């Protein structure tokens, strides 16, 4: 009788089914983040959703597994094959899922780090400037060079930054390279 290898096939697709929904709670869970979200969290988090996309990276080939299953069981494969459609299908959402808050997580890093490059070169005076080493003054400029980049990067995806934020970044960045330009001019 193949009905009861029928049969197991929709268990073990049912048990996939809901591993994915148990995987799709754990992200949103440990991965949602605002602009509170220090840096070195985030930077940690980051790390740590790798080890949920060594998961999904798993699943596809488990689902060509079933795929191959799908068709074998002969009597009903056709609603079958449906089944590991419809699993595909949800595979695909979650590593969507997972790219939203990989990107939603490094806008954040990003904008940030963002902040605190600014942070030091508007604090910067024309006394404190002759003291830093010329590579010590090109690489604080590097970072800000950076993370601006980085942002402008990481936010177009990302949730809960859009045009208007990215402009703002483009003042605070232009404000310290003016910034900058002047205490080089003041040098001599």
Known sequence: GSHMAYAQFFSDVREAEGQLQKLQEALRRKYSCDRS???????????????????????????????????????????????????????????????????????????????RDVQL?????????????????RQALHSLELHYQAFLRDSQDAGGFGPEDRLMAEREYGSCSHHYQQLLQSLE
């Open 121 to 137: 070169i508007r604090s910067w005076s024309l006394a404190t400037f002759r003291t830093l080493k010329p590579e010590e003054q």
């Open 37 to 115: 979200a220090t840096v070195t969290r985030l930077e940690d988090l980051l790390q740590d959703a790798q080890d949920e996309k060594e998961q999904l990276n798993e699943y596809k080939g488990h689902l060509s597994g079933l795929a191959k299953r799908a068709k074998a069981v002969g009597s009903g494969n056709q609603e079958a094959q449906e089944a590991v459609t419809r699993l595909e299908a949800q595979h695909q959402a979650l590593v969507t899922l997972w790219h939203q808050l990989h990107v939603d997580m490094k806008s954040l890093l990003a904008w940030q780090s963002l902040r």
